[PDB]
Structure formats: structure tokens, C-alpha cells
Design a protein around this ligand. Sequence first.
Ligand SMILES: CCCCCCCCCCCCCCCCCC(=O)OC[C@H](COP(=O)(O)OCCN)OC(=O)CCCCCCCCCCCCCCCCC
Ligand SMILES: CCCCCCCCCCCCO[C@@H]1O[C@H](CO)[C@@H](O[C@H]2O[C@H](CO)[C@@H](O)[C@H](O)[C@H]2O)[C@H](O)[C@H]1O
Ligand SMILES: CCCCCCCCCCCCO[C@@H]1O[C@H](CO)[C@@H](O[C@H]2O[C@H](CO)[C@@H](O)[C@H](O)[C@H]2O)[C@H](O)[C@H]1O
Ligand code: SF4
Ligand code: SF4
Ligand code: SF4
Lengths: 176, 155, 51, 52, 318, 44, 94, 52, 144, 115
Amino acid sequence: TYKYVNLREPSMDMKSVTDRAAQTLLWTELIRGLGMTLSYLFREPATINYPFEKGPLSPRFRGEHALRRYPSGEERCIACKLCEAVCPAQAITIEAEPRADGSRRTTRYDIDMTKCIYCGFCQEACPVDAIVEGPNFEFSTETHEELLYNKEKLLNNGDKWEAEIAANIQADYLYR
Amino acid sequence: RGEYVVAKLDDLINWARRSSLWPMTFGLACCAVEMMHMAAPRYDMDRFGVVFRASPRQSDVMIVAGTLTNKMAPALRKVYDQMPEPRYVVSMGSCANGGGYYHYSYSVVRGCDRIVPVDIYVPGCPPTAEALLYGILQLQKKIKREKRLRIWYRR
Amino acid sequence: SDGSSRPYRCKIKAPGFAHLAGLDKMSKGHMLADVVAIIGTQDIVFGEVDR
Amino acid sequence: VYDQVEFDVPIGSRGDCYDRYLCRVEEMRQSIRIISQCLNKMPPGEIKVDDA
Amino acid sequence: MFMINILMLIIPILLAVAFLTLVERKVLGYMQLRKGPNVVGPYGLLQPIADAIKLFIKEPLRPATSSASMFILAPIMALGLALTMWIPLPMPYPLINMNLGVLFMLAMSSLAVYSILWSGWASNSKYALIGALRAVAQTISYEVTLAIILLSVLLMSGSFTLSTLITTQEQMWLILPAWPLAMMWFISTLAETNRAPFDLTEGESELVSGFNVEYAAGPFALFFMAEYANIIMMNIFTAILFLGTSHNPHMPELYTINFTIKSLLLTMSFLWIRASYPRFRYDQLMHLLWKNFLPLTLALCMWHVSLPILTSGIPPQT
Amino acid sequence: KVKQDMPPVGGYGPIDYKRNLPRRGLSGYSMFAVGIGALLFGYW
Amino acid sequence: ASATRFIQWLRNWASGRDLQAKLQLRYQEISKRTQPPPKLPVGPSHKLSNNYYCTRDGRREAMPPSIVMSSQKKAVSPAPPIKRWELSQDEPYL
Amino acid sequence: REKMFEFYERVSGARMHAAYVRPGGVHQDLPLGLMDDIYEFSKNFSLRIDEL
Amino acid sequence: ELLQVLKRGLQQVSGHGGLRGYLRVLFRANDVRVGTLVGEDKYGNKYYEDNKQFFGRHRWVIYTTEMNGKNTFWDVDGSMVPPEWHRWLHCMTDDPPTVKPPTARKFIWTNHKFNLSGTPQQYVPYSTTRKKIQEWVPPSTPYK
Amino acid sequence: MNLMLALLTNFTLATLLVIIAFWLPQLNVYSEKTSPYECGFDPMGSARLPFSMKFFLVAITFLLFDLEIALLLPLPWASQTANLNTMLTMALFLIILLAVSLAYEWTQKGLEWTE
Ligand SMILES: CCCCCCCCCCCCCCCCCC(=O)OC[C@H](COP(=O)(O)OCCN)OC(=O)CCCCCCCCCCCCCCCCC
Ligand SMILES: CCCCCCCCCCCCO[C@@H]1O[C@H](CO)[C@@H](O[C@H]2O[C@H](CO)[C@@H](O)[C@H](O)[C@H]2O)[C@H](O)[C@H]1O
Ligand SMILES: CCCCCCCCCCCCO[C@@H]1O[C@H](CO)[C@@H](O[C@H]2O[C@H](CO)[C@@H](O)[C@H](O)[C@H]2O)[C@H](O)[C@H]1O
Ligand code: SF4
Ligand code: SF4
Ligand code: SF4
């Protein structure tokens, strides 16, 4: 089915022809348009008072990256390199070797935050919930180099944001 | 005391410059949509004194909002150079920050800091409108820290 | 597809590519400010036009 | 599932900007008409092909 | 004591203009479901000061291809003539009482056009040239209609003196007997002041910035200040013409209160109109004036010549 | 039991979409008469 | 929601609509930001028997193209002509 | 449009580049209470079109 | 109803501890609404809500004037909100950390830190791996 | 003298503001900054090249019509004459002829811009 958006024949009776004459000379349809912007003047605006008020987000939000630990404090990351393989932007760089004990752990874990597209494939790919995108979106920097995160920066992010991150995973993991 | 006077005069000019930032009407790709959302009613950048103006002659800030190609690079440099001083650049999003997801492309400049100096780097693909607004406020605080007249005084 | 896990070729057909190519046709006999209207009516986003 | 929702296609008559403006405005109303059917007809089940 | 009077005119004008920019931003903001300036000072009250200081410590630019003398002359002339439009305005007493105060304003308004023409030409830039030539077209569109409308109204006032318009409207606003002229006048002042929906010489969405695309910093501010000073002045002129305020000689301040309120509300409508309509195409502006206003303005001029004669209500020459 | 986002039991309430520009204002005769009446009072 | 009666009447009259019934700012009608946990269903392949993958393997049923002619009676069209569209009974004319 | 990015963000965690529709279906199921919010948004949008 | 409007306005001055506190918030936050205090964090930030305000304005924080040795009376930014209140403030949850406290881990930062970019304690990148090739070291004695 | 003082003050203040604007800010002049603006790319040809006028005929007509207002402006004074029969006829005669010329130019397509 279709409909016509603009296929009208206007009435030619005297009343309709005078109603259009008054509209042309008295600008009635232009005054009607003033009424609508007047009605907005007296509405409450939609502005929020940033940074005192914040735009609503959900637990799924994809923000700054972090590397997480188990409750014991051991790193979750096992240097499987699945996040590095799936990264659409090739933003992750990883090196690994046996730790001083026998553990399989990374020696390099970099994210070029200026290559990253914040797509979240890395946290989907991770089998142990080690790499996540956190809820933080207020980390703009004065230099480019400050956005090339090494493993120390990402572990600090996890230690900094774990309290919020764990609660967000708790809200969403049954959808995953 | 000259020290006290120049200290106060920096506050005056710094306050004027950060309170009346006029970005160039300049956007390149996806990230320009989030910039439009920062002008929209929810965030209303204009309420901070941030007003878009098209002419580079009447602009204080270039927000590089999107991918910079090699074909567009001379044009971006041209309009930056035509800004009167003082002028600032905000790099918005992964593309402008360091090439992003077209980083290895033959036609893409790997970061707009190869072409212009950059004051603030706003991460995201795209950064949320609020993330950009955070970047603009970070630029305001940077301008608030400028010590032009104090440095002139001690020359 | 060539049978593997990576596409061999992906040509993207953007509607705005054809529409913008017709901008010269549509603008015949019009003034500068109409070309502003004609660009908008085509609804162009250069991400898909340029890819 | 577009063959399961009812909607009308707007059609212009003069092939100019104004008729295309009207077509886009009316298409928004038809999108609201389709969205209303999607909310009422949303079925249960899984959301990606059960083929790992 | 006259120089003090001159300063009590220029200084308030500039301050009124500066806070008109704040009011415009707020009114557009709320009509657009947002707030507008509310951080720089309480309720954004200091925003105009920050803009003014910022612009005058910004580097000014002389384009390499520009004609230096006319490039500098044009912004000076714009602001200088904008302030000169206020000296005959009776509020209720004019700074300069002129017999032909109405004509003086027509002459100064026509001369103010050249600040657009010469700034745009002197820039030696294509967007500035296009903007300047839109000023030629827009002046050709409205002035002939604008002066004939004044003539029709003055056939009831009886003179070109601006203070006589107060006496004429002691019993009643002139908007009653001449609302058809008031409508065409109000629209003409929008085109006269280059205001939306006739904001064509700057025409931002088409010409980037039009005639003043090459201006920066203080020189740019002067054009901005001149443009907004003419918004207020021409709405004051409209209030005197059509919404005459009663003048009590022993309490002139009562006149200035009522007169100021009317001029403010007229100035708000310029912001209200800017928030509401799209822009004319500049050839459509010419056809609006020449094919609609001019035929009716010519007819009404005949009517307002005859009507005082046939009703025996010719106003006094003095 | 399965618990996923579903519409209410009887579906959602009706949703408007059709154009609605209410017809307002007076007729051409009435508006012209008011204007001519205002002119005649002003002339007198 | 906090607008006074007079302002509500003024802005309702100005727009010609009853704005209060369809406010564009959201209040308490929207969902809670904490929700009960889901329990999502499983797909049809979640079976312990009669579920051999070879019987539900879409990829392995895709065949190479059928060669109609290689360079090694009534006329036809690619498909039947398209049936003509009908005017909407909902609203044929906007 | 700002309210519709919220629907994007609630299903994908991104306001714009959701990467939500994938070969095989969608990435994640609708969060509980999302269709109620879409319905609230839709119930008022046609009035916004009229204002336009 | 106009008088009722003005009484709400006057009640805002008293609701902010007098005209000094009222002017303090008006100049710090450019807003003078009075909300219900939900709680305070260890850094001094105060969290308010008002569920009759439209979604987005129904929660807000009044930042502390001092955090981590930095004077923030005029200089505030969103990165001063600690993670536990970050979730509540951005409406990722309905429950404030007062009612639903976060899970305590030994490794979680006890002291939240704001954005440190542009300061001496900013992040500086470097390679976290050790040298890969060992160069031969010549003998320290002569013998030739 | 009042008027000349007012005119001198207006333009002096405007000149003073320009002088401050040019001598107070820190300048940094180089070739690329002061080059002509054209949306980021170098202009094609000079901006002094001829710019066609499509309303050329209306502009010339504006001259003839602008002189009519000079002839019509004295009408408020002309209404004080005792010889009101003559003035009213001649006042209406002038306006009608002005209307006739507009009708002639309108019908002959003089108001339409060239292509
Ligand atoms: C008893 C004997 C008495 C004799 C006298 C009796 C005569 C009384 C009736 C005479 C007619 C009165 C109206 C005359 C005013 C001019 C009317 C007019 O010309 O408007 C039509 C004009 C043309 O537009 P259009 O419809 O596209 O073209 C028509 C066909 N070509 O369209 C326009 O002009 C539209 C302009 C667009 C820009 C408008 C932006 C502002 C709109 C709001 C303004 C509100 C007016 C407020 C006035 C303030 C007063 C100070
Ligand atoms: C004494 C004062 C009052 C007298 C009025 C004086 C002005 C008279 C205006 C000219 C009237 C006749 O001249 C004019 O001719 C053209 C024919 O090309 C007519 O018709 C043409 O122009 C109009 C408007 O441009 C078009 O809508 C129409 O498509 C076209 O046919 C005009 O409607 C008519 O106005
Ligand atoms: C302080 C000033 C306050 C100004 C408030 C402005 C709001 C005024 C609202 C009145 C509406 C405008 O005026 C009234 O509405 C419409 C405008 O086209 C006209 O009616 C017309 O509208 C449309 C056409 O566009 C159609 O329905 C129909 O062709 C016709 O009926 C009425 O004949 C007019 O009398
Ligand atoms: S979010 Fe996407 S682009 Fe960024 S690191 Fe993870 S997989 Fe790579
Ligand atoms: S972060 Fe996860 S996916 Fe990446 S290497 Fe470590 S364990 Fe593997
Ligand atoms: S950074 Fe992301 S959103 Fe921005 S332009 Fe590049 S791809 Fe688009």
C-alpha cells in the first residue's frame, strides 16, 4: 500500500477563496508558527547541569579499558591472546612468558587507545573476564602519549574501577 | 607591585578567553554527530559560552571531529593557519587522535597532530557528547592556567 | 567469498554516491542558495559516499 | 520480518524538494506505525542462530 | 553639558547592545528547549563582558589581498553611523532636535549600507564579494517601499519632525488607522537591519559569513555592535511611529518607562521571528517587496493623501 | 521459567502516528471585517 | 511537570495542543534502572538426542552455482510482472 | 535523537556504533524493561512530528 | 499561584543554610535547587536526589571544595566522583552505595584519584619488557 | 555645533576602538594566516573578476523610482495649500504614473532576473 503526500485539489467556493486571501494578506500561517516557538519558550528546557548532573548510562556501557583480578588478587589474564586476535583495530599488543612460578602471564599488554574503536570485542573474546571496558568516559588527556596504555596503566585502571566494574558485570552477565 | 597586577591581568584575560570559546564550524565524519549532540538541548554547549562560528577568522578552537584523510589534510592546515591567535585544537575521537580503525590505510593521516598542534585529546569512537564536553571543560582549565603576562613580566 | 574466514572483496553500494553524482543534473537553472537545498534533499553522508 | 508488518509507502507527485521533504516526514510516521507492531509482536526465544 | 549628554547616550547604547546579545542567546535557547548562557556570571550575566574582552585581545588580521584603507574604514563607519542614528530620537526629548529628523535617518541608513559594500569589497575575497552584492540587491528591494511607507504615516503626523509623532498619537496609537502600513514597515525593518528571515548579506549557511568573513577580533566586533545597535534603534523608531507614548512634560520619566517597554518588546519579536522561520532566497526578497509591498504601498499612499482631505482631517503644518 | 523482555499480556496501548494539525482561527470574512472596523475607528 | 496552571494554559493555547499529556521530558513513567535478573531461553539445538549436527548444518548444504549455459518456445521474463500497488485505506491522501 | 541513542546504548553499550546486529542475529538480548521505554518514547513522538 | 512560586524561591535560600550558602551553590554549581541528601563520600562530595525532577536532573553531586590536596572550590570535573557513586550518579543502578555497598577487595584503591593529565603525576608510557638480545662483553684484561 | 560634536564623537570613539583592537593584541603574522579564505582550498582566480548582475534591470529602475520618492516627500507640506483641488489631482497623477510604470515593467518581465 502507498499514500499520496501532496496531491490535493483546493476548494474554489467563495469562503475557501477568501480564507486563503486572508491567510495571504494577514499571514495567518506565519502567526501560527510563532505560537509554536512561543509555546516552547514556556516549557522547561532539557538541559542538564553537567558536570554536576550526568547523562544516564547502562551497565553495558563501553568506556575505558581495565585489567581485572580474581578475589585473591591474581590477574585474570592468562595471555591467551584472543583479545589481540579479535581486535578489529589491531590495538592490542601482547607478549608473555612463564612467570617466576609456573604461571602463564603477560609481560607486555598494551592498548593503543587512539587505535581502539571501543567496540568491546576484546571483552567478548576474553574467556576469563580479564579485559573489560569500564564505565569511565572522562579520561581525555593533554598529550597523545598518555593514551598509549601499557600493562601497568591497565592494571591500575582495574584496581581503580573494580568496585563499579564488578557490579556492572553482575547486572549484565546473565545476558551474556 | 607589578607581580600582583600582572597576576590579576592574566586572570582577566584567561577568564575572558575560556568563557568565550568559539569553535570553528568544522566536522569530518561520525564524531561530528556527537559534536552536534553536544550543541543539542541536553548538554547545550552554548550555555558555557561555547558558540559555533563558521569563519576561521572568528574562531578560537578547532575541534577535529573525525577522520583526517591525506586529501583533506592541506585544507585542515589552511583553515587552522587562518585562525587568529590565541587558537586551540581539540582532537576528537580515535581517528583524529591517532588514525583509529583506518590507521593502516593508505589514504588516512595517522593522527591530526602530524598536521596541527593539539591541546586536548578526547578518546572514544565516538566519544560520547558528554566525553567531548568534558574535553572542552578540560581545555578551559588549561587556559585558566596560562601565565602569559607573568612570563612577560619576568622576561 | 573465497571459502576462507576473510572476505575476498566487499564493494559497498552507497545510495548517496549515485544521488550526489546527479547533483549537477538537478541544479540546472538554479541559484546558489537552491544548491544548498538540493544537497540537503539528497540526504548525503560522506562516510558511505567516500567509504 | 518486513512481510509481517503493515505500513504505507509515501509517494510524491512533483519530484522536487518539498515532496521529498513530505515523503521523509510521512516515513517517520510509518516507522512509528511499524515500531508499534514490533513491540506487540515481539516473540520469545533466542537471539542468535543456535549453531555454534 | 552637552558632551556629558552625548556620553549618557553612547555608553548606554553599547551596554544595551552587549546585553541584547545575552538576551538573544537566552531567548533562542529557551525557544529551542535549552537554556543558553548560564555559567559565565549568574544567569550568564557576565557573558557579554567575556565576549567583548575576548574579541579585543584577539589578534586582528589584515588579509594579504585586501585594500587596507577601506578595510579599516568600513567597520569604523558602521559603528559611527549606528550611534548617529540615535541622536534625533525623542525619548521623549532628542539629543538633537531636527526639523527633518525622519529624513536624516533615511540618509544615515542609506549611508550605512556602504559599510557593508566597502568591507565586503575591500576584503578581496569571493564570499565577501557575494555578501556585499547581496547588500546591493537587498537595498534595492526595500528602500523605495520603506520611504513611501514613512510618507503615508507622516501624512497623518504632518511633518518630518520625530517629536511631532508623539503629539500626533496623544489620543491613540497610529497602529489603528495604519496597521496595513505597520505590517509592511515591520517587515521592511527586518530587511533594513539584515535580520532573519532576511539575514542574507552574512547568510551564514550559504556564504559562511558573507561580507565580514575576513574580519576578526575588534574589527569584527564593531560590525556586530553596529548590527545589534540598529536592531534596537529601528524598533525604537517603530515604537515612536506606531505605538506613540503619552508625554507628561512634568514627569518625562514615565514616558521613558512606557516607551522603553514597547521598544524592548518590539526588539524581542526580532529574536522571536529569528527562532521561527527559514531564510528567504535573496531574489525572493526582491519579488516580495516589488510585487506585493510596492503595489499596496503605492495604493495606500494615494489613500493617505486623499483621506485627510476628504475627511477634513489634515494635520497642522506646525 | 524463562524471563526475557516481552510485551505486556494484552499488548501495548494504542500509539498515534497520523498527522494532526488542528484547525484553528476565524474565517476570512470575520478577520477582514475586524481589520476594516479597526481602520474606520482609527480614521475617525 | 512543575509548570503552574496559567503557564500550562498559555503554552497549551500557543501550540494548539494539549502538551501536558505528552510531555517530552521523562519522569516516573520510565523503567527502573535496577531490574530483576533475566533467565533467557535456549535455542532449538539444545537437545540431548536426535540432534546430530550433520542434519542441521546450513553451511555444508550450500552448493556451487548451477551452470545454465557454458561456452565450453515461449519468451520469458526474470519473474512475473510486479502486481500493481493499492491505495491505503488507512489514509490514501496525506 | 538523544533519547534514541539511549536505546542503542542500553542494548549495546554504545550510543552510535553499536556493532549490535551481526551475521546470525544480534549480539545480546533486550535488557528487561527496554520495550516499555521504547513504547513510552513512541507514544509521544508523533506529536513531535506535528510540531515540526 | 504566583505567590506560591515566589515562596518556593524563598524556601531555596533557607534550604541552603542562608543567603551565604545559597550564593555559594549558585556560584559554584549555577543551580540552587534543594534536594534530598542521599549521602557523602570520604572525599567530601555530597549526593542529592529529587524524583520529581525529570530524568537526568533527578540526581546530582555537589563536589567537595578540596580533594587529594587540590583546591577544587572553583575547579571541579566529573573525574572526581569515586567509582561507587559513579554507578549511582550515572543511573546505571537505582541503589546508592550507602544502601548497596560495593564488594570489598584488598587490591581496590582506598583513595580515588581524579584525572591527572597535565600534572607531574600524569601517566607516561613505556615498554614493560626486558632487553631481548644480550651483547657480548669483551674481557676486561689485555691479551693480544 | 551640537550636531558636529555628536558626529565627531561617534566616529572618534569608533576609531579609538579600532586603534585599541590593532595595537593591544599580540600579533603573529605570516603568509598562510593572511591568505584569502575559501573553505580551506586556494581560490581559483581573483575576486576582482566580473560578477554578473542578474537584477541589472531592476537596479536601473530603482534609480527612476528613487527619484519619485524625492518628488513625493513634499506631499505633507503640499496638503497645507488652499488650492487643494489642484494638489490632490497632481499628487494622484504622479502616483498613478509611478504605478503604471511598475505595471509596464512587471508585465514586460523586467522584474524577473536574467538567466
Ligand atoms: C475603508 C478603506 C480602507 C482602505 C485600506 C483597507 C486595506 C486593508 C487590507 C489590506 C491588506 C493588509 C495587509 C497588507 C500587508 C502586506 C500583505 C502582504 O503582502 O503579504 C503577502 C506576502 C506575499 O507572500 P506570498 O503569499 O508568497 O505571495 C502572494 C502572491 N504572490 O507575504 C508576506 O509578506 C510574508 C512576509 C514574510 C516575513 C514575515 C516575518 C514576520 C511575520 C510576523 C510579523 C507579524 C506582524 C507584526 C507587525 C508589527 C506592527 C508594528
Ligand atoms: C495606483 C496604485 C495601485 C496600482 C497597482 C500598481 C501595480 C500593478 C501591478 C501589475 C498588474 C498587472 O501586471 C502583472 O502582469 C502579470 C502577467 O505577466 C500577471 O501575472 C503574472 O505575474 C504573477 C506574479 O508574478 C504570477 O503569479 C503569474 O504566474 C503571472 O501570470 C501579474 O499578476 C500582474 O500583476
Ligand atoms: C503576544 C502575541 C501572541 C501570539 C500567539 C501566536 C499564536 C496564535 C494562534 C492562532 C493561530 C493562527 O491563526 C489562525 O490559525 C490558522 C493559521 O493558518 C488559520 O487557519 C488556516 O490554517 C491552516 C492553513 O495553514 C488550515 O487549517 C486552513 O487553511 C486555515 O483554516 C486561521 O484562519 C487563523 O485565524
Ligand atoms: S574495544 Fe575493540 S578496538 Fe578497542 S581494544 Fe577492544 S577489540 Fe580492540
Ligand atoms: S585479556 Fe583475556 S582474551 Fe586477552 S590475552 Fe588475557 S585472558 Fe586472553
Ligand atoms: S573516531 Fe570513530 S566515530 Fe569518530 S570518525 Fe572515527 S570511526 Fe567515526
